[PDB]
Amino acid sequence: ARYDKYNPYGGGFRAPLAADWTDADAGKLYAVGINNVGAVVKGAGQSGVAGVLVLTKGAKAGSIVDVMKFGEVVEFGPTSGTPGTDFGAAGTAYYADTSTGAINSTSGEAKVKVGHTVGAQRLIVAVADGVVDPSPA
Amino acid sequence: EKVPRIGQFGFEKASEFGVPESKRTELSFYQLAYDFEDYDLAFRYTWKFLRDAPSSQIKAYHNQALQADAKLIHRKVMEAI
């Protein structure tokens, strides 16, 4: 995955990274949140899910990252896939697991919708306010 | 007298896509002034006294008022401290 359209004014925001992200995560997309210290963590923090993050290379804790709330992500596929391979399905909604920050097409009441795909490899990012269903039957 | 001051701000760590928080600052001041006051003294005579008194006593009186002035300014400078 890569950022393709990013808007610095309310489309995304600067925050410090809470822990090291390794080159094993390079080019993966995760959903992310803010911990009680004000730094970026995978999954929901205290904030709920705040946005999505891609790093093109590994990054150290306390370095600044650009979290995306609204934009376009290209070369997209599920977080469990391999970058530049195993792309998304065309025309479908994508959801974060709030615990791990992993993104896939399977909906669930406790999950957060992050966007939908326009053709297999492009995700239109537009992160929801909260979980799909906070009051199941 | 007016003594102004200005607030101050610092940098932020940069990033690859996003943009910085904005910075502002504001003025404020103290101010101080100097007091002012008026002081009086008198000589009074009867007509018989000015007819009969030596003119040297009047010059001696004028000189002693001009001394009482220098005493006054010193007290009011030391009171200020």
Q: How far is A133 from chain B (nearest CA, A)?
A: 32
**For residues A65 and A61, what is the distance between their CA atoms, to the nearest angstrom?**
10
Q: Do B17 and A3 touch (CB under 8 A)?
A: yes
Please tell me whether residue A30 adopts helix, strand or coil conformation.
Answer: strand
Q: Are A88 and A76 spatial neighbours (Cβ–Cβ below 8 Å)?
A: yes
Question: What resolution in Å is listed for this PDB structure?
Answer: 2.7
For A80: left if phi > 0, alpha if psi spans -120 to 50, otherwise beta; the answer is alpha
Q: Where are the beta strands (DSSP E) in chain A?
A: 2-6, 12-16, 29-34, 40-42, 51-54, 64-68, 70-74, 93-96, 103-104, 112-117, 123-126
**B69: Cβ–Cβ under 8 A, 6 or more apart, which residues?**
none
Q: How far is A68 from chain B (nearest CA, A)?
A: 10
Task: Say which experimental method was used.
Answer: cryo-EM
Q: Do B18 and A12 touch (CB under 8 A)?
A: yes
Chain A residues whose CB is inside 8 A of the B19 CB are: 8-9, 14
Q: Do A8 and B14 touch (CB under 8 A)?
A: no
SS3 content of chain A, % helix, strand, coil (to 5): 0, 40, 60
Q: Do B17 and A64 touch (CB under 8 A)?
A: no
Q: Are A79 and A111 spatial neighbours (Cβ–Cβ below 8 Å)?
A: no
SS (H, E, C) B3-60: EEEECCCCCCCCCCCCCCCCCCCCEEEEECCCCCCCCCCCCCCCHHHHHHCCHHHHHH
Other CB atoms within a 10 A radius of the CB of residue A94 amount to: 29
Beta-bridge partner residues of B66:
none
> In this complex, which of A8, A16, A63 lies closest to B18 when CB atoms are compared?
A8
- Per-residue burial over A12-51, b = 16 or more CB atoms within 10 Å of its CB, e = otherwise: bbbbbbbeebeeebeebbbbbbbeeeebbbbbbbeebbbb
